[PDB]
Amino acid sequence: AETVAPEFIVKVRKKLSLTQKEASEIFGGGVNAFSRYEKGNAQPHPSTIKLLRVLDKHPELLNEIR
Amino acid sequence: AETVAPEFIVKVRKKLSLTQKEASEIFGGGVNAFSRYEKGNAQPHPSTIKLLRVLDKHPELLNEIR
């Protein structure tokens, strides 16, 4: 499974001007998902990692998914 | 949770020239994930749905994630 640095998750979430709660709602994983991901205590779903990588490069795509 | 038609999943997977096995590896969900999704017998992760919607519009983004 592709892995991801917790710091990368924080970076992209903040670039998108999302709260942890909002990110968890949009990307899935349950209410406290991003809180755990950003502490390195859970692994996001592979699709969450890949979607975050896409959004890091093309943040305007948030308007297509939110 | 946003829902998705099984036919949409098939459409995007085939547009991307992926097998069910390849899609399951790239997007996650386990080996038989797409087999189940395309029969309507499991719900993809929210990030999988959103990433498929992005790829339907911008299929070239497969090169950023594969």
Numbering used by the authors:
A (entry chain A), B (entry chain A): 66 to 131
Show sentences the authors wrote.
Our biochemical and structural analysis of the E. coli MqsA antitoxin and the MqsR:MqsA-N complex provide a detailed 3-dimensional structural view of the free antitoxin and the TA complex. These structures combined with our biochemical data unequivocally demonstrate that MqsR, a protein previously shown to be critical for biofilm formation and the most highly upregulated gene in persister cells in E. coli, and MqsA form a novel bacterial TA system. Our data show that, as expected for a TA system, the expression of the MqsR toxin leads to growth arrest, while co-expression with its antitoxin, MqsA, rescues the growth arrest phenotype. In addition, MqsR associates with MqsA to form a tight, non-toxic complex and both MqsA alone and the MqsR:MqsA2:MqsR complex bind and regulate the mqsR promoter. MqsA itself is a two-domain protein with a novel fold that, unlike every other antitoxin, is well-ordered throughout its entire sequence and whose structure does not change upon toxin binding.
MqsA-C, the helix-turn-helix (HTH) domain, is composed of five tightly packed α-helices, which bury a central hydrophobic core. This core is composed of eight residues, including Val69, Val77, Leu83, Phe92, Phe99, Tyr102, Pro109, and Leu117. Of these, all but one (Val69) are perfectly conserved among the MqsA family. Structural similarity searches demonstrated that MqsA-C shows significant homology to the bacteriophage 434 Cro repressor, the P22 C2 repressor and HigA antitoxin, placing it in HTH-XRE family of DNA binding proteins. The MqsA C-terminal domain is necessary and sufficient for binding the mqsR promoter (PmqsR), as incubation of PmqsR with MqsA-C results in a shift in the electrophoretic mobility of the DNA. In contrast, no shift is observed when the DNA is incubated with either MqsA-N alone or the MqsR:MqsA-N complex. These results show that DNA binding is mediated exclusively by MqsA-C. MqsA is the first antitoxin that has been shown experimentally to bind DNA via its C-terminal domain. In MqsA, the HTH-XRE DNA binding helix corresponds to α-helix 4 (α-helix 4 highlighted in green). Moreover, MqsA α-helix 4 is the only stretch of residues that is perfectly conserved among all MqsA proteins. Taken together, these data provide strong evidence that MqsA binds DNA via α-helix 4.
